Ligand binder design. Structure first.
Ligand SMILES: O[C@@H]1[C@@H](O)[C@H](O[C@@H]2CO[C@@H](O[C@@H]3CO[C@@H](O)[C@H](O)[C@H]3O)[C@H](O)[C@H]2O)OC[C@H]1O
Ligand code: ZN
Ligand code: ZN
Length: 185
């Protein structure tokens, strides 16, 4: 299934120039931001989906994540599969690792108060992370075999909700500037 969902949220800090391009393509050029999340993917996430992307530009100047980004409800859980970042590698409570798609990821949990909610309001968010141990090379076609992460998480006691909200390959930033250009499929 092709992408059907455009994610474009900013807390209003700084400049977030996001372009919804053709197909699965988007770009972001940002300057001195607060928090923002831009990406393309699917309105209804799946634990069985293989997300493909090609980040032709990954140029954060400060904190930016090049990451799968999604939510589940019942219960409310936010998840990430971070392939690359800028000046900050996100971490949390260490749970283990998972190998997937030619990389090794550390698995983390975190609980964030006053976090952006599914719709951009605020909420207490339980978050599951796979974070690559080194930044993934960009500019070639890349796969995130998400089932590998879901299964690894499950095996470490990290169960997702039964109701799936959106699931995107995102640029998230905080307190930074940068450029990204990503095609998702
Ligand atoms: O950032 C941009 C890159 O993402 C872009 O790379 C191309 C991305 O698309 C790849 O082809 C896809 C194959 O799957 C189909 O379903 C999609 O519709 C196609 O887009 C292609 O092989 C990559 O080269 O290059 C330009 C960059 O700006
Ligand atoms: Zn394990
Ligand atoms: Zn709301």
């Amino acid at each position: 299934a092709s992408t059907d969902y455009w994610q474009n949220w900013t807390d209003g800090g700084g400049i977030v120039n996001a372009v919804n391009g053709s197909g699965g393509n988007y770009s972001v050029n940002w300057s001195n931001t607060g928090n923002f999340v831009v990406g393309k993917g699917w309105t209804t996430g799946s634990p069985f989906r293989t997300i493909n992307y090609n980040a032709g530009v990954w140029a954060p100047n400060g904190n930016g994540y090049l990451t799968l980004y999604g939510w589940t409800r019942s219960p409310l859980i936010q998840y990430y599969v971070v392939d690359s970042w800028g000046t900050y590698r996100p971490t949390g409570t260490y749970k283990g690792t998972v190998k997937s798609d030619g990389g090794t990821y550390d698995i983390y949990t975190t609980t964030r108060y006053n976090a952006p909610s599914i719709d951009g309001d605020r909420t207490t968010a339980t978050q599951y992370w796979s974070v690559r141990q080194s930044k993934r090379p960009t500019g070639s076609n890349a796969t995130i075999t998400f089932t590998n992460h879901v299964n690894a998480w499950k095996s470490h006691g990290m169960n997702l909700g039964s109701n799936w909200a959106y699931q995107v390959m995102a640029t998230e930033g905080y307190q930074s500037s940068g450029s990204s250009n990503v095609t998702v499929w």
